[PDB]
């Protein structure tokens, strides 16, 4: 047991981490000792600050550890009991460095009521004025450091990053913290190691070889304690590690992490606190010599290990600390500011309280904790002792809870000249202030986040592999809609996509549209077989003009006008637009057309009113058979004018939709009973009179068989496709409703023949 | 002084003495009994022998940690497995915060307080005794089981009554019990003012329960202050008022039928022989009994005036927590005795693994996870010992109801008991079956019959009005009257909304059962005699009117007839398109029929073959007024044809009803080509029967024009008796014309 027991009217306990625990810490524990030491003797040797009593100290050693720190800490305790070495009262102490060190002694302080004050124990963990009540902090709490860390990754478009911490209370509160701060920017951790503090075979190269089998994270973020910092540095050379490490103040700006394994470390960034050296505490330091330095069991220890001799067998013993192998450490200022709280607080708190002389007066023979620190320290504001800025940082204030204010800064290993070291980069007061100046790895910023990158609206299938937080894209959706991240859900077979991709809209079907391309071709017909019906009414119009007797066809000519001209008509409402009156219309209209005029037919060629009475009869019976069944086919027109050709979405096309076979069943039967009555005929062997007229309508008629039984094989073969295959549908409709005019010219040159 | 009793293992205590007699010396002596009674008992720990190390706590904060800093600074005397203490929630709570660093777990005894129930600042913390929390859960469930809803919660200003308060609230939420009021009972702020307060439980007479987590004087001068007021009350009372007679003292008040709920406690029969048989001569052991034998017999022993009193007098009487502390040292040696069976198997003595105390792992694993039977049982097989994953000991509470039927006051009577289950006697409830309720609470407005409903909840979450809609408004999900089918009621399916398909179709007969008949009587009646002209053909033609009008003629009149028999059917989608192509064909060849054969007259003061041409002209006419009206009418079955507060009782098709005004200005053009027809014929002598049918049928498109306007008012919103009604008259005016238009025929003929 090694500890320092400079007495005094009052006593000031300390914890520092002096052994990393055989071997001795260089930069953080006697560096840090020194300052304590050099804060105390200026207390005694001041005027305007606690008068006429001398400070003492109770410095001890933590060895890093968290349970050795509580075994150490329990000395503190040993004068405030008065029940039964001699120990001595503490007025408060000084935290340890560690997290995990402070969080122990905390605890134990908080019963006996003894004010702790740390230096450099950033944790989240801790602030938390309901357990540990009896501390404060002159360094900012770590969550500020998760917000620089996200600014940091997200200025530089870093997006995958991986994660690591120590096992201590340090290592895992900071990485939740980081956890809110990487979602908010729209980034996220690949993995979250927790390594512990055991060995480095065991745990530290399973690590590295994690993330050494995925090269695809070319930036990780380094949030650990120091002690944890050396032996995976060390590893990384080992297994040969090229990573931009993003370290927090653990790390810091170190040069003893980095000895003999510099050569990974390239470009790494560390974050460090702000602070200015102090000038004074230069001197003190590079003048200290083991002949004058007695106070100190452990600098023998220091400097047999930092000057490498035996007090290299025994060296020149006339070597000193001088700026050639010395470096100020960063958290100085803030372990002089810690020694300084209690020494301003006291005398906030010894003269007010006792006026009348500035000494112990009776009334501070026991110490009280309640009052000492709510009161006192919480409101303590002073300017910085030895520092030539008088600005807002310079004045030290406790906030609500007990701390200080964000002032991290951006360091950057920043090799140059051949000499290695640190060279600041930005500050991070409340925005960034990076300035572009840091020699990264090879020849520029690493990039990261190549398992995900920014795609285009054309492929929208966000689908998530076996990994996480980083899609790959792939070419989804032939015409459809993606309404989710990584869905591509198929739309209507009758819609088409929208522009936004969000839906499917319904896309304009094309109708035959009159005036057009071959699609009018039927058209020309249709307008052509007006002309015919134009030409029928010009015979009937000489018809009336004194018919010949002889004739016969008192009313069956006008029944076969009638059916031709209607006939032409249909072939309009066939080429017209797919209304529901006129998709019901176009299966009548086509069935008892054709009906009618083979029924004149067929009767004229088989007194006068009883065949007149049978055409209509047998026209008639056909007629009532369309629309029994046409309410089993009529009842779906509203219903109808519906998409159909639905192949695969390829521009599909809005039509009658219904009756489709139907109709071509239904004129199966209506020209059965035509050709059934054709070759009833026989030729008609009978008299002459009318013999040249049944001879027309046996060459007609058998001229319609022939057409009839080629037309039917014509529909089939071009069923859907409207437009492009309909049209010949249409065309064959048209031309089916022109040769039955030209049937009906066989009766208009036997007209002829009548007229001259 | 410290206690020490040689053995392996040295167990720790930290039990009040400071003398203090019957919590301090009963305890310590409880522990001490039991230790030496498990040192010679077998099955546990056979080899090894427990030891003791006893430090007073002075009921002080700092004077226990002064004390317990001896427990840490042993293996930071031999190392400590465990100490045993927590008789006081602060000392509990300071000696639990400086024993979690150096991983040495306790067992409580006493510590009832719920701040100590959060593992996150305790984690090596457990306690034998139910914390104070507990007794909420049975307080909810005693109150479901009795239909008990509306409660009058009353808390205190202490973190005991705060914390039952809160746990009584979070946990009542799963058992569907809400607080009509909460209030706070101070420190004893006033005696006025807890007349105020009991005022302010008691403004709603709906409620008539009321929680009281309330300390015992707390509670005893609000039950007076009730009785000065003398109100009636059910108290479902806490363990502060739990089976005290000084509490209730000799204010009866409304006490009666009180549920309290007391913790249980086992009548050890081992420990009082035991007890009763200490002398401050034997048990040396001791350095607080000299004390507390001088302070309890008032005697001093440099006087020797202490050996005539001895304790063989005085009755014993444990104070109901001498269990606990058997339980919990119980519960340590038998953790020790896992730790030897898992640990040590190979060597039945304690092996070189067990040296280390092992904290960590032997309260996490082997300390939570501890099942032993119930030591020094009074046979009533309850134990059930079992921390829970909280660090907290379970046990069993003693329903004690008021009642003062059997002694006159004061007579606590044990109803059942509450572990791991509700257990009430009804029976020995003074609130028996002959009774009108037991002292109902209830709820507000909870019971409805689910028939009316409205539940709102315009005030308390219980409270929720169950009113019905004026129409029912198609209720569908019991909250808000939705629209399924319709504004008025439905047919209302399985207690839900509806859209009932049910109309009136006018089939069989109901009131048109005349017009029904007559129109098929007259159709088949008109067709035959039409034949009968048409048998000869040659006479008729002789005597001008030939076939032309006969066909046109005898056309009209069938389509007419049967105009008026299709009007009797379902309003399908066909129904109502074909209504319209009724009368706007069916009227339009009679119109046209009478107006080609007055045309003719009139031209001839002739185009036999045209004549026919110009009928079907206008025929045609009509008809293409009526496609092109239909194709934009679209007709359709309408729904709506009853008014807002009737259910659905038509079908008429609403397009048809718009048509049929259009269907008048239809038939008006049929109506002026016939008025028009009639002037051209001017006078009409010799055969111009037709002419007195004209003016007939003039009379009848009058009359039917004079049925129009009915039709748009009330003809058409009536039960269609008188539409349908309508449709007969035209067409038996249309074969009254017939009957004076083949009325030569009639008498030629015969
Ligand atoms: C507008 C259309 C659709 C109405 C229905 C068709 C009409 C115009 C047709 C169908 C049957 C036809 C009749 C059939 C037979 C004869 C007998 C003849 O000696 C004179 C013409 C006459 C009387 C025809 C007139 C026109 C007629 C009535
Ligand atoms: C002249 C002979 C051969 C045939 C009789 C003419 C027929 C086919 C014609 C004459 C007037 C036409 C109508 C005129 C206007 C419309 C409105 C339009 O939105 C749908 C088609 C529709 C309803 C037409 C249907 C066909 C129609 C009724
Ligand atoms: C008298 C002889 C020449 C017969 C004349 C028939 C005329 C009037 C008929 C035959 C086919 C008819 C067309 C058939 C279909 C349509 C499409 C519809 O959306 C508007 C009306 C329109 C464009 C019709 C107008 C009238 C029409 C051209
Ligand atoms: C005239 C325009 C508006 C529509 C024409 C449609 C054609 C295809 C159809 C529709 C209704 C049909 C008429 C309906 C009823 C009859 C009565 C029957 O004893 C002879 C045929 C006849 C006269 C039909 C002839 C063909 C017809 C006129
Ligand atoms: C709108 C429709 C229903 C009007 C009527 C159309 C049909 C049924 C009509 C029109 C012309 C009529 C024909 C006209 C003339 C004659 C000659 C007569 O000696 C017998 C009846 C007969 C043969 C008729 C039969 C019915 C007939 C064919
Ligand atoms: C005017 C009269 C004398 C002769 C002509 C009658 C014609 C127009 C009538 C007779 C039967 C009728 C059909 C009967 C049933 C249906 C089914 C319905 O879902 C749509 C209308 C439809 C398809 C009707 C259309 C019109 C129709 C074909
Ligand atoms: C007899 C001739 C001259 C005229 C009448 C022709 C008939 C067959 C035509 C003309 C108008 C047509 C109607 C026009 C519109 C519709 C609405 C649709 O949702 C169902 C079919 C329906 C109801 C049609 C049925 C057939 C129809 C009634
Ligand atoms: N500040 C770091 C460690 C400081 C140091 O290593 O000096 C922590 O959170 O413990
Ligand atoms: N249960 C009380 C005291 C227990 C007792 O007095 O027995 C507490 O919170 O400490």
């Not at chain 1, 305790?77 to 905390?106: D, E, F």
């Not at chain 2, 007024?625 to 194709?631: E, G, N």
């Not at chain 2, 039709?711 to 349908?724: E, G, L």
Request: glycine share 6%.
């Amino acid at each position: 047991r090694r500890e320092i027991k400079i007495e005094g009217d009052l006593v000031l306990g300390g914890l520092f981490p002096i052994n990393e625990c055989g071997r001795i810490n260089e930069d953080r524990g006697i560096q840090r000792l020194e300052a304590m030491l050099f804060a105390i003797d200026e207390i005694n040797k001041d005027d305007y600050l606690l008068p006429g009593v001398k400070l003492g100290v109770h410095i001890l050693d933590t060895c890093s550890r968290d349970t050795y720190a509580l075994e150490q800490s329990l000395e503190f305790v040993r004068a405030s009991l008065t029940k039964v070495n001699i120990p001595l009262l503490i007025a408060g102490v000084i935290g340890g460095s560690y997290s995990s060190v402070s969080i122990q002694v905390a605890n134990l302080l908080r019963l006996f009521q003894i004010p702790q004050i740390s230096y450099a124990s950033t944790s989240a963990k801790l602030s938390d004025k309901s357990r540990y009540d009896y501390f404060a902090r002159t360094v900012p709490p770590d969550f500020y450091q998760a917000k620089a860390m996200a600014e940091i990754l997200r200025f530089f478009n870093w997006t995958y990053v991986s994660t690591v911490a120590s096992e201590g209370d340090y290592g895992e509160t900071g990485i939740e913290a980081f956890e809110q701060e990487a979602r908010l920017r729209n980034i996220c951790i690949a993995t979250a190691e927790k390594v512990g503090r055991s060995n480095i075979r065991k745990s530290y190269d399973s690590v590295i070889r994690e993330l050494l089998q995925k090269p695809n994270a070319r930036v990780v973020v380094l949030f650990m304690r120091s002690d944890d910092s050396r032996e995976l540095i060390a590893a990384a050379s080992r297994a040969n590690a090229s990573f931009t490490w993003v370290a927090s103040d653990g790390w810091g700006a170190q040069e003893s992490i980095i000895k003999g394994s510099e050569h990974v470390a390239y470009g790494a960034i560390t974050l460090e606190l702000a602070s200015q050296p102090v000038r004074q505490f230069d001197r003190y330091f590079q003048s200290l010599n083991p002949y004058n330095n007695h106070r100190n069991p452990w600098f023998r220890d220091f400097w047999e290990q930092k000057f490498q001799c035996s007090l290299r067998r025994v060296c020149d013993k006339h070597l000193a600390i001088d700026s050639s192998n010395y470096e100020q450490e960063s958290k100085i200022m803030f372990v002089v500011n810690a020694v300084y709280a209690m020494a301003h607080a006291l005398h906030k708190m010894q003269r007010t309280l006792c006026p009348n002389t500035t000494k112990l007066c009776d009334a501070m023979k026991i110490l009280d904790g309640k009052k000492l620190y709510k009161d006192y320290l919480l409101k303590i504001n002073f300017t910085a002792p030895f520092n030539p800025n008088k600005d807002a940082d310079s004045i030290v204030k406790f906030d609500t809870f007990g701390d200080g204010m964000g002032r991290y800064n951006v360091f950057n290993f920043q090799n140059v000249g051949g000499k290695y070291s640190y060279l600041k980069v930005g500050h991070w007061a409340e925005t960034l202030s990076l300035d572009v100046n840091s020699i990264h790895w090879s020849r520029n910023s690493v990039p990261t986040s190549q398992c995900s990158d920014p795609c285009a609206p054309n492929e929208m299938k966000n689908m998530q592999p076996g990994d996480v937080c980083c899609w790959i894209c792939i070419p989804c959706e032939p015409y459809e809609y993606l309404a989710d991240e990584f869905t591509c859900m198929d739309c209507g077979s009758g819609q088409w996509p929208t522009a936004d991709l969000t839906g499917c809209y319904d896309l304009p079907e094309d109708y035959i549209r009159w005036e057009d391309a071959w699609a009018i071709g039927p058209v020309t017909i249709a307008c052509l077989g007006f002309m015919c019906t134009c030409m029928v009414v010009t015979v009937f119009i000489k018809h009336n003009n004194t018919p010949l007797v002889k004739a016969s066809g008192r009313e069956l000519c006008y029944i076969l006008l009638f059916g031709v001209g209607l006939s032409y008509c249909m072939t309009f409402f066939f080429i017209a637009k797919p209304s529901p009156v006129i998709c019901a219309l176009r299966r009548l209209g086509l069935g008892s057309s054709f009906a009618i005029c083979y029924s004149a037919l067929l009767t004229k060629t088989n007194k006068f009113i009883s065949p007149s009475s049978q055409v209509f009869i047998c026209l008639g019976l056909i007629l009532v058979q369309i629309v029994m069944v046409s309410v089993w086919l009529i009842l779906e027109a509203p219903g109808t004018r519906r998409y159909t050709l639905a192949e695969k979405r390829e521009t599909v096309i809005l039509k009658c939709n219904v009756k489709d076979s139907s109709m071509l069943i239904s004129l199966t039967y209506d020209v059965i009973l035509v050709i059934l009555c054709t070759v009833y005929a026989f030729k008609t062997r009978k008299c002459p009179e009318n013999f040249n007229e049944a001879k027309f309508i046996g060459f007609t008629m058998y001229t319609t068989c022939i057409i009839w039984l080629a037309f039917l094989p014509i529909f089939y073969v071009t069923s859907s496709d409207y437009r492009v295959q309909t049209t010949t549908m249409c065309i064959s409709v048209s031309l089916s409703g022109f040769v039955v005019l030209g049937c009906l010219f066989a009766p208009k040159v036997h007209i002829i023949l009548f007229q001259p | 002084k410290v206690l020490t009793l040689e053995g392996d293992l040295v167990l720790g205590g930290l039990f009040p003495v400071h003398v203090n007699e019957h919590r301090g010396i009963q305890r310590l002596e409880a522990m001490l009994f039991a230790l030496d009674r498990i040192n010679r008992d077998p099955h546990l720990l056979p080899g090894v022998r427990l030891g003791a190390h006893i430090l007073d706590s002075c009921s002080k904060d700092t004077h226990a940690l002064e004390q317990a800093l001896d427990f840490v600074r042993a293996s930071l005397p031999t190392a400590i497995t465990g100490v045993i203490g927590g008789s006081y929630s602060d000392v509990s709570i300071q000696v639990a915060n400086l024993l979690r660093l150096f991983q040495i777990p306790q067992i409580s005894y006493a510590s009832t307080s719920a701040k100590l129930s959060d593992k996150s600042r305790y984690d090596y913390f457990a306690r034998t005794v139910p914390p104070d929390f507990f007794q909420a859960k049975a307080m909810a469930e005693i109150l479901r089981f009795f239909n008990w809803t509306y409660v009058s919660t009353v808390a205190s200003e202490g973190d005991y009554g705060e914390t039952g308060i809160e746990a009584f609230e979070l946990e009542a939420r799963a058992r569907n019990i809400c607080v009509a009021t909460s209030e706070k009972v101070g420190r004893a702020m006033s005696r006025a003012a807890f007349e105020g307060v009991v005022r302010a439980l008691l403004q709603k007479p709906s409620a008539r329960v009321a929680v009281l987590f309330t300390r015992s004087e707390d509670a005893r001068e609000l039950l007076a202050a009730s009785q000065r007021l003398n109100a009636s009350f059910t108290w479902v009372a806490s363990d502060g008022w739990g089976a005290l007679e000084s509490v209730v003292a000799g204010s009866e008040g409304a006490a009666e039928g009180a549920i309290t709920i007391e913790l249980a406690s086992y009548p050890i029969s081992d420990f009082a022989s035991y007890f009763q048989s200490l002398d401050p001569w034997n048990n040396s052991r001791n350095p607080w009994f000299r004390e507390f034998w001088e302070q309890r017999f008032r005697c001093s022993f440099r006087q020797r005036d202490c050996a005539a009193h001895s304790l063989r007098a005085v009755p014993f009487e444990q104070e109901s927590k001498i269990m606990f502390v058997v339980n919990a040292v119980y519960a340590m040696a038998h953790a020790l005795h896992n730790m030897h069976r898992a640990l040590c198997p190979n060597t039945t003595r304690l092996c070189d693994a067990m040296r280390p105390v092992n904290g960590r792992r032997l309260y996490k694993d082997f300390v939570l996870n501890v099942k032993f039977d119930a030591p020094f049982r009074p046979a009533d097989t309850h134990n059930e010992v079992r921390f829970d994953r909280f660090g907290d000991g379970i046990g069993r509470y003693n329903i004690f109801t008021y009642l003062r039927a059997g002694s006159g006051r004061y007579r606590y009577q044990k109803v059942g008991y509450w572990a791991e289950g509700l257990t009430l006697d009804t029976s020995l409830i003074p609130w028996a079956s002959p009774s009108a309720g037991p002292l109902p609470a209830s709820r507000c407005s909870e019971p409805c019959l689910q028939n009316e409903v409205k539940s709102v909840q315009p005030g308390e979450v219980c409270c929720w009005l169950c009113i019905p809609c004026q129409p029912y408004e198609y209720r569908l999900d019991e909250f808000t009257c939705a629209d399924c089918g319709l504004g008025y009621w439905p047919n209302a399916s399985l207690t839900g909304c509806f859209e009932l398909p049910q109309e009136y179709i006018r089939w069989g007969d109901a009131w048109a059962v005349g017009p029904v008949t007559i129109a098929c009587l007259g159709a088949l009646a008109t067709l035959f005699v039409l034949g009968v002209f048409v048998r000869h053909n040659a006479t008729p033609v002789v005597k001008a009117s030939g076939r032309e009008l006969c066909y046109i003629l005898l056309g009209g009149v069938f389509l007419c007839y049967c105009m008026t028999f299709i009007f009797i059917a379902k309003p399908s989608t066909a129904v109502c398109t074909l209504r319209r192509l009724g009368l706007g064909t069916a009227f339009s060849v009679c119109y046209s029929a009478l107006l080609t054969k007055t045309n003719r007259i009139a031209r001839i003061f002739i185009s036999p073959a045209s004549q026919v041409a110009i009928c079907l002209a206008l025929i045609s006419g009509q008809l293409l007024i009526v496609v092109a009206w239909l194709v934009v009418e679209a007709p359709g079955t309408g729904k709506e044809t009853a008014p807002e507060r009737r259910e659905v009782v038509t079908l008429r098709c609403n397009h048809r009803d718009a048509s049929m005004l259009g269907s008048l200005a239809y038939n008006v053009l049929l109506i002026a080509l016939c008025t028009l027809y009639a002037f051209k014929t001017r006078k009409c002598p010799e055969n111009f029967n037709e002419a007195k049918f004209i003016g007939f049928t003039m009379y009848t498109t009058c009359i039917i024009w004079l049925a129009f306007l009915p039709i748009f008012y009330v003809t058409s919103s009536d039960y269609r008796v008188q539409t349908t009604t309508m449709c007969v008259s035209v067409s038996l005016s249309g074969s009254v014309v017939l009957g004076c238009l083949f009325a030569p025929k009639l008498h030629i003929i015969l």
